[PDB]
Amino acid sequence: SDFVVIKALEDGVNVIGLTRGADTRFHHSEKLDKGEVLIAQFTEHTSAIKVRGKAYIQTMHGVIES
Amino acid sequence: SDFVVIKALEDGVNVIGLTRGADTRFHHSEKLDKGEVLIAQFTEHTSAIKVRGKAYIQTMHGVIES
Amino acid sequence: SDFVVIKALEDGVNVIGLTRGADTRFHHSEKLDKGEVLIAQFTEHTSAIKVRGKAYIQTMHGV
Amino acid sequence: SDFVVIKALEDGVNVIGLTRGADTRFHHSEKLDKGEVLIAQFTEHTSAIKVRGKAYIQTMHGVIES
Amino acid sequence: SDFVVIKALEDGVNVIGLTRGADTRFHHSEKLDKGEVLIAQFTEHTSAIKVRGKAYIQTMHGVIES
Amino acid sequence: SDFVVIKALEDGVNVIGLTRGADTRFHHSEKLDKGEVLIAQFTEHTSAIKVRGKAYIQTMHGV
Amino acid sequence: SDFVVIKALEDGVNVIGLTRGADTRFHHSEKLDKGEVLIAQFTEHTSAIKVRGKAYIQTMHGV
Amino acid sequence: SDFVVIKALEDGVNVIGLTRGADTRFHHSEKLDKGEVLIAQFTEHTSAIKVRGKAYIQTMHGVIES
Amino acid sequence: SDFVVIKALEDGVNVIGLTRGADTRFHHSEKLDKGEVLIAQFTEHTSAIKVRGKAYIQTMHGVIES
Amino acid sequence: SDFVVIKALEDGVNVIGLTRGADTRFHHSEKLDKGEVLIAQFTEHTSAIKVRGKAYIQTMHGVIES
Amino acid sequence: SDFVVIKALEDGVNVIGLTRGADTRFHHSEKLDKGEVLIAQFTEHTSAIKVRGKAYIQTMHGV
Amino acid sequence: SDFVVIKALEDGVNVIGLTRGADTRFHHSEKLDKGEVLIAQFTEHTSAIKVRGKAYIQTMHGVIES
Ligand SMILES: N[C@@H](Cc1c[nH]c2ccccc12)C(=O)O
Ligand SMILES: N[C@@H](Cc1c[nH]c2ccccc12)C(=O)O
Ligand SMILES: N[C@@H](Cc1c[nH]c2ccccc12)C(=O)O
Ligand SMILES: N[C@@H](Cc1c[nH]c2ccccc12)C(=O)O
Ligand SMILES: N[C@@H](Cc1c[nH]c2ccccc12)C(=O)O
Ligand SMILES: N[C@@H](Cc1c[nH]c2ccccc12)C(=O)O
Ligand SMILES: N[C@@H](Cc1c[nH]c2ccccc12)C(=O)O
Ligand SMILES: N[C@@H](Cc1c[nH]c2ccccc12)C(=O)O
Ligand SMILES: N[C@@H](Cc1c[nH]c2ccccc12)C(=O)O
Ligand SMILES: N[C@@H](Cc1c[nH]c2ccccc12)C(=O)O
Ligand SMILES: N[C@@H](Cc1c[nH]c2ccccc12)C(=O)O
Ligand SMILES: N[C@@H](Cc1c[nH]c2ccccc12)C(=O)O
């Protein structure tokens, strides 16, 4: 099962889960302060993930650092 | 399931999901402002993804940037 | 399932999906303007994809 | 599921699908003008593919350029 | 399913499918003129493929040319 | 199933498990003191893990 | 299923299929003339293949 | 199933199993004195493992030592 | 399904199939003259193969040449 | 199915199996004298293995020599 | 299923199979004389193998 | 299924199959004279193979010769 690693590079980063299904809305926003890490899966309820703010992101595809 | 990473390189990038099935229409357009990232799977409802605007994109096949 | 990445290098690139089944016709053509990207899977309804117009294209086999 | 990429290197290339089953006949011919690309799967209805005209062809086995 | 790529290097190459099952006979012969290509799977009906004429052939095992 | 290796590099590192399902809340926070290690899986109940505090972290994607 | 690639380097190469089962006999011999190619699978009916005559042969193990 | 190797580098190292399920508590603490090794799987009952004390640890992800 | 390639390096090579089951006896011996090749599978009826005479043998493990 | 190789580097090494299930206790201790080797699987009854004494240990993760 | 290759480098090497299950005892010890080889699988009845005596041993993890 | 290649390097090599199950006895001994080869699988009836005599042996793990 696929997952995303997000490390915040500043205060106030948001990681937002978008709902799986015919409809798409934000179901949760997790706040990260500078240096906090979130390792989040794709799930039965989450089929897309949006990241706002300067962040280091790893997935199976590789890395993107803000 | 396969997924795409999109990093917006300018304001107002749109990531659009196209419906799976006999019919094809846009079901959702997620706006991304500069530096924001979307990690989005293909799903039961989305079998094609369209990106408009300056974006850095990674898939299983590699990177596509501009 | 397998997918193709198409980036339009001109305006009006057509990504044309062809029907899975005994019959072969286009059921959808998605237009891409210069610099726009489509990542499109093979699916229950699409078993062949045609690209008309100048495009950078990636598949599992390469670019 | 296996697939073939065909890029036409001249006008009037034909990509022809041959029927799956005990009988073999052409069920469809798709025309490609110079520079047009066809990415076609093997399917429930297509077990062989014939290409006529100068074409660049990729499969899992590698490349043949006319 | 496994497949074979055949590129005809002269006019009048024949790609022949041999029947799967207790009995073995030719069920189809596809003629290829010079530069024409056939990508052909093994199937429920075809368990051996015969090539006659000058051909460049790729399989999973490699290339065989002349 | 997939797992994460967290080594605390300060006292009071919190490894926070978030609920699998429609709702997202923390159901458990495991505290790690400096030098202590937690190897934690994704499971039926945990679909996201947050680490608060300075930590060396390994996943399938790298450190 | 596994297959063998035989290219005849003389006239009258015989590719001989032997019966899968308790009994072992040839059920088919396919003749190849010089330069002709047979790509032949193992199947429900063929569990051993014999090549008589000079031939270039590829399998999963090499040439 | 995935497993962890722990080698104690001092007396009194504890390897603790945390319960799988909605609830999370310690169910067992195995003490390791210097040079002693535990190879421990994740299981139906254990979905997280905690190490306290100076240890050399190997997992699928690599080594972690001190 | 596993298989053995045998090429005879002299006249009179024998490739012998030993029966699968509680009992073990030779069920067939195939003769190979110099330069003849046998590609033989392990099967429902054959769980061991004996080769007598100077032969070049390939399996998944590699090569043995007499 | 995963397994551990233990070679004793002194007399009196013990390899101890810990029970699978909600409860954890030692179910068996196998003694190894210097140079004796134990190759032990994880099983329906054993989910953790403890080694006491100077030992060379290999698992899928690599080697630890006392 | 997984297997071990034992080559005896002295006379009287014992390859000892231990019972799969709740109980652990030896159910079989196969003696090897110098230079003799045993290739032995893990099975429904054997979940641990002990080698007593000087031996060259290969597993999936190496020698 | 896994298999072993044995090449006899002297007359009178024996390849012995040991029974699978709760009981262990020899069920078959195949004699190999010099240069003769046996390729033998593990099976429903054979879960250990013993070689006596000078032999070159290949398995999935590598080669063992003398
Ligand atoms: N509700 C959408 C979410 C989604 C996933 N991938 C997307 C790509 C573009 C737009 C929306 C999405 C779905 O499950 O299909
Ligand atoms: N509704 C279409 C969407 C699609 C996927 N790939 C395509 C390629 C071309 C055109 C449309 C598509 C389908 O599910 O099949
Ligand atoms: N309707 C055809 C479409 C197709 C796929 N691959 C092809 C190759 C050639 C011609 C047509 C096709 C089918 O599903 O089989
Ligand atoms: N109708 C044939 C088509 C075919 C596939 N591979 C071939 C090779 C040779 C000749 C015909 C074929 C079949 O399904 O079997
Ligand atoms: N009881 C929790 C244990 C757990 C696993 N990974 C975690 C990460 C953080 C907190 C707790 C956990 C569960 O099975 O899901
Ligand atoms: N309850 C959410 C937790 C979650 C997983 N990945 C996420 C990414 C973003 C936001 C929330 C999450 C879920 O199971 O889907
Ligand atoms: N009718 C034969 C065709 C065949 C496949 N491989 C062969 C090798 C030799 C001779 C015939 C064959 C079968 O299906 O088994
Ligand atoms: N009828 C035999 C054919 C065979 C396959 N491999 C062999 C090796 C040796 C001798 C005969 C064979 C069988 O199906 O088992
Ligand atoms: N009848 C035996 C044949 C066999 C396979 N591997 C062996 C190794 C040694 C001796 C005999 C065998 C069986 O099916 O098990
Ligand atoms: N009875 C425990 C044994 C165990 C496995 N891994 C562990 C890690 C730590 C403590 C105990 C264990 C179980 O089956 O889950
Ligand atoms: N009858 C034993 C044979 C065996 C396999 N591996 C062993 C190792 C040691 C002793 C005996 C064995 C069993 O099937 O389990
Ligand atoms: N009867 C034990 C044998 C065993 C396997 N691995 C072990 C490790 C240590 C001690 C005993 C064992 C079991 O099946 O589980």
mmCIF file with all atom_site columns, N, CA and C in Angstrom, chain D residues 3 6-9 12 19 30 32-33 37-38 40-41 44-45 47-48 50 55 57 59 63 65-66:
data_model
loop_
_atom_site.group_PDB
_atom_site.id
_atom_site.type_symbol
_atom_site.label_atom_id
_atom_site.label_alt_id
_atom_site.label_comp_id
_atom_site.label_asym_id
_atom_site.label_entity_id
_atom_site.label_seq_id
_atom_site.pdbx_PDB_ins_code
_atom_site.Cartn_x
_atom_site.Cartn_y
_atom_site.Cartn_z
_atom_site.occupancy
_atom_site.B_iso_or_equiv
_atom_site.pdbx_formal_charge
_atom_site.auth_seq_id
_atom_site.auth_comp_id
_atom_site.auth_asym_id
_atom_site.auth_atom_id
_atom_site.pdbx_PDB_model_num
ATOM 1  N N  . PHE D 1 3  ? 1.393   -4.186  -24.857 1.00 0.00 ? 3  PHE D N  1
ATOM 2  C CA . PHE D 1 3  ? 1.065   -3.149  -25.818 1.00 0.00 ? 3  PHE D CA 1
ATOM 3  C C  . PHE D 1 3  ? 2.244   -2.744  -26.711 1.00 0.00 ? 3  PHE D C  1
ATOM 4  N N  . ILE D 1 6  ? 3.435   2.593   -31.906 1.00 0.00 ? 6  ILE D N  1
ATOM 5  C CA . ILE D 1 6  ? 3.777   2.787   -33.296 1.00 0.00 ? 6  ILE D CA 1
ATOM 6  C C  . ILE D 1 6  ? 3.798   4.272   -33.596 1.00 0.00 ? 6  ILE D C  1
ATOM 7  N N  . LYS D 1 7  ? 4.908   4.785   -34.114 1.00 0.00 ? 7  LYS D N  1
ATOM 8  C CA . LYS D 1 7  ? 4.922   6.127   -34.627 1.00 0.00 ? 7  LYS D CA 1
ATOM 9  C C  . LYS D 1 7  ? 5.154   6.064   -36.131 1.00 0.00 ? 7  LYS D C  1
ATOM 10 N N  . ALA D 1 8  ? 4.287   6.717   -36.886 1.00 0.00 ? 8  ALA D N  1
ATOM 11 C CA . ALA D 1 8  ? 4.417   6.771   -38.336 1.00 0.00 ? 8  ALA D CA 1
ATOM 12 C C  . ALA D 1 8  ? 5.579   7.700   -38.737 1.00 0.00 ? 8  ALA D C  1
ATOM 13 N N  . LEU D 1 9  ? 6.424   7.206   -39.643 1.00 0.00 ? 9  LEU D N  1
ATOM 14 C CA . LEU D 1 9  ? 7.553   7.967   -40.188 1.00 0.00 ? 9  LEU D CA 1
ATOM 15 C C  . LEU D 1 9  ? 7.248   8.476   -41.607 1.00 0.00 ? 9  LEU D C  1
ATOM 16 N N  . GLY D 1 12 ? 0.233   7.683   -44.408 1.00 0.00 ? 12 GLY D N  1
ATOM 17 C CA . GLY D 1 12 ? -0.455  6.492   -44.872 1.00 0.00 ? 12 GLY D CA 1
ATOM 18 C C  . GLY D 1 12 ? -0.053  5.180   -44.219 1.00 0.00 ? 12 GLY D C  1
ATOM 19 N N  . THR D 1 19 ? -8.038  -10.710 -35.693 1.00 0.00 ? 19 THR D N  1
ATOM 20 C CA . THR D 1 19 ? -8.968  -11.237 -34.704 1.00 0.00 ? 19 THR D CA 1
ATOM 21 C C  . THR D 1 19 ? -8.382  -12.381 -33.902 1.00 0.00 ? 19 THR D C  1
ATOM 22 N N  . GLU D 1 30 ? -6.194  1.167   -38.665 1.00 0.00 ? 30 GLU D N  1
ATOM 23 C CA . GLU D 1 30 ? -6.113  2.538   -38.209 1.00 0.00 ? 30 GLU D CA 1
ATOM 24 C C  . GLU D 1 30 ? -5.023  3.188   -39.048 1.00 0.00 ? 30 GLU D C  1
ATOM 25 N N  . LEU D 1 32 ? -2.338  6.189   -39.862 1.00 0.00 ? 32 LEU D N  1
ATOM 26 C CA . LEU D 1 32 ? -1.499  7.163   -39.195 1.00 0.00 ? 32 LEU D CA 1
ATOM 27 C C  . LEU D 1 32 ? -0.811  7.999   -40.253 1.00 0.00 ? 32 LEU D C  1
ATOM 28 N N  . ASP D 1 33 ? -0.910  9.311   -40.112 1.00 0.00 ? 33 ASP D N  1
ATOM 29 C CA . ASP D 1 33 ? -0.100  10.205  -40.934 1.00 0.00 ? 33 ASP D CA 1
ATOM 30 C C  . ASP D 1 33 ? 1.233   10.400  -40.247 1.00 0.00 ? 33 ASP D C  1
ATOM 31 N N  . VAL D 1 37 ? 1.114   8.972   -33.426 1.00 0.00 ? 37 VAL D N  1
ATOM 32 C CA . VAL D 1 37 ? 1.504   7.826   -32.607 1.00 0.00 ? 37 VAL D CA 1
ATOM 33 C C  . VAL D 1 37 ? 0.277   6.993   -32.234 1.00 0.00 ? 37 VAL D C  1
ATOM 34 N N  . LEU D 1 38 ? 0.393   5.669   -32.332 1.00 0.00 ? 38 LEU D N  1
ATOM 35 C CA . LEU D 1 38 ? -0.642  4.781   -31.799 1.00 0.00 ? 38 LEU D CA 1
ATOM 36 C C  . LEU D 1 38 ? -0.049  3.867   -30.732 1.00 0.00 ? 38 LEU D C  1
ATOM 37 N N  . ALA D 1 40 ? -1.237  0.729   -28.769 1.00 0.00 ? 40 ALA D N  1
ATOM 38 C CA . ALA D 1 40 ? -2.303  -0.248  -28.863 1.00 0.00 ? 40 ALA D CA 1
ATOM 39 C C  . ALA D 1 40 ? -2.013  -1.503  -28.046 1.00 0.00 ? 40 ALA D C  1
ATOM 40 N N  . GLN D 1 41 ? -3.016  -1.947  -27.292 1.00 0.00 ? 41 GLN D N  1
ATOM 41 C CA . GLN D 1 41 ? -2.932  -3.180  -26.533 1.00 0.00 ? 41 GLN D CA 1
ATOM 42 C C  . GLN D 1 41 ? -3.311  -4.420  -27.348 1.00 0.00 ? 41 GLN D C  1
ATOM 43 N N  . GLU D 1 44 ? -8.897  -8.955  -25.779 1.00 0.00 ? 44 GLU D N  1
ATOM 44 C CA . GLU D 1 44 ? -9.846  -10.044 -26.004 1.00 0.00 ? 44 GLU D CA 1
ATOM 45 C C  . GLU D 1 44 ? -10.173 -10.207 -27.494 1.00 0.00 ? 44 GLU D C  1
ATOM 46 N N  . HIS D 1 45 ? -10.145 -9.112  -28.250 1.00 0.00 ? 45 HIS D N  1
ATOM 47 C CA . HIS D 1 45 ? -10.470 -9.182  -29.668 1.00 0.00 ? 45 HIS D CA 1
ATOM 48 C C  . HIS D 1 45 ? -9.277  -9.142  -30.650 1.00 0.00 ? 45 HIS D C  1
ATOM 49 N N  . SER D 1 47 ? -5.255  -10.377 -31.261 1.00 0.00 ? 47 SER D N  1
ATOM 50 C CA . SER D 1 47 ? -4.139  -11.203 -30.804 1.00 0.00 ? 47 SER D CA 1
ATOM 51 C C  . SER D 1 47 ? -2.894  -11.040 -31.684 1.00 0.00 ? 47 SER D C  1
ATOM 52 N N  . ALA D 1 48 ? -3.042  -10.283 -32.767 1.00 0.00 ? 48 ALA D N  1
ATOM 53 C CA . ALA D 1 48 ? -1.925  -9.975  -33.638 1.00 0.00 ? 48 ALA D CA 1
ATOM 54 C C  . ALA D 1 48 ? -2.130  -8.609  -34.250 1.00 0.00 ? 48 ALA D C  1
ATOM 55 N N  . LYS D 1 50 ? -0.545  -5.997  -37.344 1.00 0.00 ? 50 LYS D N  1
ATOM 56 C CA . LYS D 1 50 ? 0.286   -5.813  -38.547 1.00 0.00 ? 50 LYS D CA 1
ATOM 57 C C  . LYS D 1 50 ? 0.480   -4.327  -38.837 1.00 0.00 ? 50 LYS D C  1
ATOM 58 N N  . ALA D 1 55 ? 7.665   3.014   -40.157 1.00 0.00 ? 55 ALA D N  1
ATOM 59 C CA . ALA D 1 55 ? 7.195   3.247   -38.784 1.00 0.00 ? 55 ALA D CA 1
ATOM 60 C C  . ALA D 1 55 ? 8.256   2.961   -37.748 1.00 0.00 ? 55 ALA D C  1
ATOM 61 N N  . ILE D 1 57 ? 8.626   1.407   -34.130 1.00 0.00 ? 57 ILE D N  1
ATOM 62 C CA . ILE D 1 57 ? 7.822   0.496   -33.323 1.00 0.00 ? 57 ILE D CA 1
ATOM 63 C C  . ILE D 1 57 ? 8.562   0.150   -32.044 1.00 0.00 ? 57 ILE D C  1
ATOM 64 N N  . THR D 1 59 ? 8.122   -2.265  -28.479 1.00 0.00 ? 59 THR D N  1
ATOM 65 C CA . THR D 1 59 ? 7.432   -3.235  -27.647 1.00 0.00 ? 59 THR D CA 1
ATOM 66 C C  . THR D 1 59 ? 8.343   -3.534  -26.460 1.00 0.00 ? 59 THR D C  1
ATOM 67 N N  . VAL D 1 63 ? 13.120  -1.928  -29.880 1.00 0.00 ? 63 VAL D N  1
ATOM 68 C CA . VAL D 1 63 ? 12.726  -0.995  -30.932 1.00 0.00 ? 63 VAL D CA 1
ATOM 69 C C  . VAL D 1 63 ? 13.052  -1.519  -32.338 1.00 0.00 ? 63 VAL D C  1
ATOM 70 N N  . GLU D 1 65 ? 12.948  0.591   -36.049 1.00 0.00 ? 65 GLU D N  1
ATOM 71 C CA . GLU D 1 65 ? 12.719  1.823   -36.805 1.00 0.00 ? 65 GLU D CA 1
ATOM 72 C C  . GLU D 1 65 ? 12.906  1.549   -38.292 1.00 0.00 ? 65 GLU D C  1
ATOM 73 N N  . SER D 1 66 ? 11.905  1.921   -39.087 1.00 0.00 ? 66 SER D N  1
ATOM 74 C CA . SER D 1 66 ? 11.927  1.697   -40.539 1.00 0.00 ? 66 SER D CA 1
ATOM 75 C C  . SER D 1 66 ? 12.916  2.616   -41.277 1.00 0.00 ? 66 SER D C  1
#
